[PDB]
Structure 1
Amino acid sequence: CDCKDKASKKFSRFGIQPCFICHGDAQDPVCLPCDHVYCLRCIQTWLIPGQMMCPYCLTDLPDKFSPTVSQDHRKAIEKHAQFRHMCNSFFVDLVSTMCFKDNTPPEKSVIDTLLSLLFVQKELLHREHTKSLSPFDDVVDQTPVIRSVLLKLLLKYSFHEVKDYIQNYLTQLEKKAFLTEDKTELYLLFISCLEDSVHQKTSAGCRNLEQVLREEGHFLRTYSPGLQGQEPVRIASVEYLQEVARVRLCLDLAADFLSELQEGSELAEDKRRFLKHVEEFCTRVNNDWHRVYLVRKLSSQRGMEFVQSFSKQGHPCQWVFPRKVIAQQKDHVSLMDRYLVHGNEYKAVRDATAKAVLECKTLDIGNALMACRSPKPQQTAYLLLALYTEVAALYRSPNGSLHPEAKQLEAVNKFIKESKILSDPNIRCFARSLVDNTLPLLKIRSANSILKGTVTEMAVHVATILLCGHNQILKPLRNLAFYPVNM
């Protein structure tokens, strides 16, 4: 600190200061006759009423904020800013490396002074900001920001000895910064920092899978609920967020085991016991937000059709779903139409193509196609992809299989013979193969039956793009898809 201040007097004649208004470094620096460096925006929004005087030393400025210094103050503020950045990088490197060297934690009062040097307490004028680990006072953010660097560097130790310190930091942030605001974001940040700390204390530690499975099982079957304590509006102990993060990793492990379970064989009689304990835990408590977390993790790791395959009627993994979502779910759970990426002009033509599927009138697709901008290549792609998604949603489903053969291929073929939008002989030789199911991409014969759908979708999408796209940077790939003897 006194290195910095004797540095500033060496730099620019006794005291480059931040502006008293903004509490930060000056932009377009105006100098008072009393050696004051202020912001230009702050002095134009401040000096124009009847306060032609000084905020700091109460000195009357005579004329106007006319002296700007285009020689001294930009390079002075530049050098002092480079110096404060280098010194704050120095301080954060020292508290990262030397204050936290080995497995024993530092003393109490040094941790208290680190947590107290984050605050810039009362000064006569916005009070009580939060700064980016600086040993100085003259750096500001005029919005209270909350980082996670000290939180991760305190939680490299055992959790049993750093509960009260982060708890006291939490009580300080609640009493001065986050009184009545969105505490959900800070609580999720704390849950994420504790779960990252347990990831580090398990993965960088050296122990086998059986001991960690036995101890998390012993956590499960001895879990007192106790949720009435840290519930209502403000009470959030670090033990409570540690319990929620620990059960989130238990459900993460259980969801990894279920994703392993569906893909392969039996789970060696001990992972079975762990999944049984996860089942007993989730069927004991009605805190089904954690079950929502389980289904969000399984939807994230594998896909939507994965939990659709879980959502059948007698699979022995049905307990991973809440009680209301299964009784009001039918067996006609159709698939997602990923081609709405085009948006608001493919949606109209696919709705009208579903209309011409259900009825026999085929002019509706032509009316929807003339109700669209964005011309001829994308329009042809919309029409061909709409025809694909309708004949695919018919042929896949067991109830309505082979529906355009029921006197309806005559109507769409009449639309082919009438409308010149797709009766180009390469588009036409594609479309004849797509109407009567004689395109050899539906018979891709992948026996997994979940990624098989995706592979069919990617193949017909890139074929639709290569046909409908009249583009130079598609001229090789067309030769890769229709002339392999010429390749």
Structure 2
Amino acid sequence: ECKETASKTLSRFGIQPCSICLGDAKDPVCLPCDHVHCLRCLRAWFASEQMICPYCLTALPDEFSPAVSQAHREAIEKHARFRQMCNSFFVDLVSTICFKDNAPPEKEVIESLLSLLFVQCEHTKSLSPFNDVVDKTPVIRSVILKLLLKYSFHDVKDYIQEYLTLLKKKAFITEDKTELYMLFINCLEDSILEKTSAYSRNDELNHLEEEGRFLKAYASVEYLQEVARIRLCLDRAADFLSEPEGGPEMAKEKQCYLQQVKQFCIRVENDWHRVYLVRKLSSQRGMEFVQGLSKPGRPHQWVFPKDVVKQQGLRQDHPGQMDRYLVYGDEYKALRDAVAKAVLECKPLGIKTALKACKTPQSQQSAYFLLTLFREVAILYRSHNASLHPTPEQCEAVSKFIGECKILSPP
């Protein structure tokens, strides 16, 4: 009622929505019938050459021409920032004080907030107690969900179930629960890691020991929470074993935790956890490290997948030294494969074929030449096997090539 009565001094007749835009107005004209109409949205309906105002059903004469108003526009925009900022900042800061402690306020308070979450086509406003205007296609805001999740998960399981049920009864939105299930899992992951992994080192290791013991004694939100908790456990195991040499000691709890994690990985019969662990390790320190450390035949292969190891051992010719210099374009790839083929088959025409078809300036062309020379010769020579090194005859071939080509003018 504060907001319902505030619209007296800021507007002579009071600010009300229109029908052409079904909300606020831009370039607002006040018609003789006292209706604020958006000129920008007026054009979209008046391009049909039928001047009809469907709100008041007034057949306005064609002589009248709605136009731009400056004082009216500023009066509208002042309130259009007023009420948005006021309601938003009040609702967030009262959510700070309504849900401070660990004890949930009540069933009714949160149920009323969730029914207020729709406007009373259900979700269109920005989570206010008023009748605010229609926003973009209904976005599932989690601004209040996180502060409705800092409590204990078991006590708020009913709350989460009710929230998901009212979300699924929202509108004609597709029932592809993947894009919202991942969001719910990530949000509860954030809640659990921010409320259960920040006590201290001793409390954290006690919690980890209790979790391991409970795991020994081992669509729904329970399934989502289980997935998130096992994901956190495997990520913790990953970055807890993803340490360089220098820690042979401390394995009193390390050998226990890694062994129990691998026992769960064996028991689950699911490869999603281990492929996720591989992805996490690659994000941690690179796909090259996971392609070199988990080489075919390495005793370190219990953490990494097994069928992948077999089908990669069948493909052991390519180790994974992938050419990360694709940021320039496919042209570099073209001359790179041409150079590789020409050097391997002992002829200079393969490099020349890509040399002719290069419209770019010769500076970065010589850059490509030197960098491809690196990518072939230095990477083939990086292997300890002298057989895999470029042959000395190939060295003489590239030597008489560099004596042949004069592109590399600088000494």
TM-score (norm 1): 0.78
In 2 relative to 1, CA 169–209 (structure 1 residues): closer, same or farther, beyond 3 Å? closer
Aligned residues: 407
- Amino acid in the other structure paired with 1:202: T
CA offsets 1:21-61 (integer angstroms, 9 cap, x no match): 43332122233332222333433333455864333333332
Matches within 5 A, 1:130-149: 130-149=124-143
- 1:274 corresponds in structure 2 to 257
- 2:180 corresponds in structure 1 to 186
Matches within 5 A, 1:282-297: 282-297=265-280
- Amino acid in the other structure paired with 2:253: D
RMSD value, Cα: 2.3
Equivalent residues of 1:395, 1:401 under 8 A apart: no
Equivalent residues of 2:197, 2:204 under 8 A apart: no
Runs of 4 or more above 6 Å deviation: none
Query: What SS does structure 2 have at the residue aligned with 1:11?
Result: coil
- 2:109 corresponds in structure 1 to 110
Query: What SS does structure 2 have at the residue aligned with 1:340?
Result: coil
- 1:465 corresponds in structure 2 to none
- 1:217 corresponds in structure 2 to 212
- 1:373 corresponds in structure 2 to 359
Q: Does 1:242 align with 2:221?
A: no
- Following TM superposition, by how much is the alpha carbon of 1:267 offset from its aligned partner in structure 2, in angstroms? 4.3
Q: Does 1:345 align with 2:322?
A: no
- 2:403 corresponds in structure 1 to 417
**Larger displacement relative to structure 2 (296-305 or 398-407):** 398-407
In 2 relative to 1, CA 218–258 (structure 1 residues): closer, same or farther, beyond 3 Å? same
Q: Does 1:361 align with 2:347?
A: yes
Query: What SS does structure 1 have at the residue aligned with 2:321?
Result: coil
**Larger displacement relative to structure 2 (62-71 or 192-201):** 62-71
Match of 1:311 among 273, 294, 302: 294
- 1:452 corresponds in structure 2 to none
- 1:259 corresponds in structure 2 to 242
Query: What SS does structure 1 have at the residue aligned with 2:145?
Result: helix
How far apart are the structure 2 equivalents of 1:352 and 1:67? 68
How far apart are the structure 2 equivalents of 1:338 and 1:205? 42
Match of 1:208 among 199, 203, 207: 203
Equivalent residues of 1:156, 1:197 under 8 A apart: yes
- Amino acid in the other structure paired with 2:206: Q
Question: Which consecutive residues of structure 1, in runs of 5 or more, have no partner in the other structure?
Answer: 122-126, 224-235, 426-487
- 1:174 corresponds in structure 2 to 168
How far apart are the structure 1 equivalents of 2:214 and 2:292? 31
Equivalent residues of 1:348, 1:368 under 8 A apart: yes
- Following TM superposition, by how much is the alpha carbon of 1:355 offset from its aligned partner in structure 2, in angstroms? 0.7
- Amino acid in the other structure paired with 1:355: K
CA offsets 1:404-442 (integer angstroms, 9 cap, x no match): 4431222212221121101421xxxxxxxxxxxxxxxxx
How far apart are the structure 2 equivalents of 1:142 and 1:313? 52
How far apart are the structure 1 equivalents of 2:216 and 2:47? 70
Equivalent residues of 2:278, 2:304 under 8 A apart: yes
Equivalent residues of 1:288, 1:322 under 8 A apart: yes
CA offsets 1:163-218 (integer angstroms, 9 cap, x no match): 11121111111122475244222111111110100111124435523312122213
Question: Which consecutive residues of structure 2, in runs of 5 or more, have no partner in the other structure?
Answer: none
